[PDB]
């Protein structure tokens with residue numbers, strides 16, 4: 001069973017001894033610190049609140065277990081047993097903490113307060129930053145949602161330019177990252193964040209997370225279709241690739257089907273196998289059940305373009321109203337190797353240059369989508385900005401001489417709409433002057449209870465692109 | 470509760486329909502594919518086997534849930550209910566799978582077989598690659614362990630060169646990554662992998678993982694010391710940084726204590742606060758309880774060197790037997806910002822150039838240690854190499870025309886010692902010719918049981934540096 005007393009950075013165990021004496025309040029905030037990725041999607045806090053922070057999270061057994069571990073870990077007795085005892089006795093083990101946050105799904109420019117944390121009982125001044133470690137891991141669903149949305153923007157721009165609309169946009173980037181992330185839990189969280197922006201996923205863990213913690217009106221938030229892997233092609237033997245292809249498209253003759261085509265020679269597979277030997281099984285397929293040819297190696301741009309050129313000469317191509325070339329509806333292509341935000345951009349720009357509509361292609365992304373991201377990317381960061389000592393509130397901050405980018409905000413914070421409709425974070429408790437509208441942060445957690453929740457449907461709505469609006 | 474029927478990539482749900490008819494065996498293998506990082510530490514499979522794969526992993530309820538989810542996910546009924554029911558009924562839900570693996574902790578050159586997987590019941594031919602996704606997540610602990618060991622190699626070389634010994638090596642790279650990883654589960658796995666090589670960690674989650682799945686003779690596998698963070702310094706107020714320092718080092722006067730010193734002006738803190746105002750509290754400390762000064766911003770190399778030059782002029786410096794400068798034993802430095810394998814190398818080399826012993830410094834690493842890694846780094850990969858169809862075994866492989874680096878191995882594999890004492894992987898069942906002695910892989914999982922296991926102490930022993938040996 002999870003033990004919040006063992007879910008912090010070791011050194012925080014010692015911090016209760018280091019704050020100024022007579023400190024009754026410690027107030028901290030999270031931002032994606034300023035100084036590409038100019039705005040971030042706030043998503044994932046609700047998962048953390050519900051899974052780890054709510055309810056009776058302190059018990060006698062958990063305190064003793066923590067005491068036992070820390071004794072050995074530090075080779076010394078430092079550990080605030082009395083402080084944790086207090087929470088257990090006075091609050092039945094519920095955390096005397098208040099968290100206020102911008103609504104999930106909201107898209108906020110860098111350098112704004114996204115949530116704040118403070119103790120609600122003076123005895124628990126040390127608790128605010130105890131939970132920094134667990135709360136800061138919200139960086140991951142924020143960053144996955146944000147990077148996924150930025151890719152959607154690229155896809156939308158090029159799809160609109162080359163086709164004149166956005167049909168199918170929400171299926172143009174599929175999550176292939178299940179095997180490529182660091183754990184089962186990470187897979188579920190990351191997959192859920194991608195689904196804020198798209199509907200295609202193979203990372204099944206995401207579905208159950210959304211249902212349990214957020215919820216959708218639809219049965220599931222994400223979808224997939226039958227597809228081959230190299231094992232299901234290569235198992236037929238090197239000389240029987242055609243047989244494998246035929247068996248697979250025939251098994252799935254009435255649904256869309258993706259077939260990896262690069263086991264031996266992608267260009268041969270497209271020109272001679274699909275384009276000649278098995279052409280009769282492709283041209284007969286429904287518009288709702290195309291063959292999706294999947295290259296999986298080589299330079300992503302070069303391979304995509306060469307695959308399109310080969311297919312364009314074996315299959316009947318039209319030119320759409322924008323002047324771009326379009327494969328017949330029963331045939332499409334997906335590139336799912338080496339795709340990240342950089343290579344996605346290069347591929348669609350290259351296609352546009354060669355007069356191929358983005359209607360022709362879809363993408364899959366694995367490591368690039370769910371693993372190749374860090375907390376540094378959006379500078380997701382949690383800092384103390386206000387304390388009360390001897391009954392006096394003081395505005396606190398860091399401001400390292402050698403790195404102005406690491407300066408933190410001062411005092412009590414609030415998030416507001418500007419007169420032009422943008423966002424501003426007010427410092428030093430200036431929000432109390434009420435010269436702006438209402439504070440956009442809402443209490444989402446107080447004293448062990450989740451106080452405000454969002455469905456996944458609401459989150460999707462909040463994270464919509466402008467071009468969709 | 471975890472459901473293995475829901476812990477695979479979506480498309481694999483459809484693979485049982487795609488293999489050649491009458492396939493009785495699918496045999497697959499995992500390697501860190503060839504073409505820095507010339508050898509990898511094999512670590513983490515044992516966690517996966519015990520947490521996810523062993524015992525009764527299939528129930529009537531789990532089957533029904535998966536069926537209901539996939540119906541919606543695919544908008545069709547393609548889920549192999551009968552296949553999963555067979556396992557439930559025939560094997561009381563235990564997986565008829567045999568896995569053979571190299572010993573955990575082993576250090577093996579790239580491009581060798583590390584583990585193999587095959588079904589033990591011909592009806593379960595589809596099961597081998599169903600569990601690809603979960604087994605391939607072993608990439609993460611392998612890669613963290615490997616990259617952590619590569620950093621140890623660097624620290625060893627320079628510590629040995631500048632000091633004449635390796636005293637304290639195992640505490641020279643501390644895990645600061647808890648907040649910077651993508652999940653709680655990832656934190657535990659990654660921290661455990663770092664502890665294969667070092668003994669310093671703040672990622673508490675790693676301790677319980679090791680205790681449950683591996684075990685040590687010692688009470689805990691990793692340790693920490695009291696340390697400040699920006700909040701426990703800045704909470705005192707901008708004008709009271711000296712007061713914060715004095716309070717903290719007085720509270721922790723008889724144990725080592727690390728104090729972040731860059732909240733406002735690192736160079737001032739070193740020269741004026743530590744070096745003058747509070748000097749009397751530092752020079753009085755025990756060799757067993759040094760002050761560890763922690764810069765945390767600026768160019769890592771430039772800041773480390775300037776911090777050392779400052780301290781060297783305020784405190785009594787000696788010259789060790791190797792001719793390098795050494796701070797007094799009550800004073801040390803730790804760099805814990807922007808440390809990864811590249812910058813670690815730059816710092817120790819720059820210190821050597823400026824005649825500072827590596828005895829003076831330790832490192833902390835967070836994102837660089839536990840998060841900024843992908844499956845692509847060591848090319849961790851799982852592929853089918855052998856199948857039996859209509860009673861005939863065939864050697865199978867991929868070999869993409871555009872990327873020779875993605876060619877996979879053929880047929881039944883085994884791992885052997887060469888006449889010179891190195892590793893070789895034999896393909897095509899050639900291990901059976903018995904010209905290369907015994908297979909070095911061991912059966913670690915068979916039919917729902919873990920059949921061979923390693924303590925964390927054994928793993929540490931296997932992973933030692935040659936220089937330590």
Ligand SMILES: O=C(Nc1ccc([N+](=O)[O-])cc1)C1CC1
Pocket residue numbers: 174175176177179202224225226227258336364366478480
């Ligand atoms: O293509 C699909 N899934 C999939 C493909 C490749 C990987 N991978 O890891 O390379 C993982 C999953 C289905 C949407 C059609």
Ligand SMILES: O=C(Nc1ccc([N+](=O)[O-])cc1)C1CC1
Pocket residue numbers: 009011643644645646648671693694695696727805833835
């Ligand atoms: O320095 C320590 N812990 C620690 C410091 C900084 C971070 N961080 O994330 O920045 C995390 C943990 C203790 C070993 C003394």
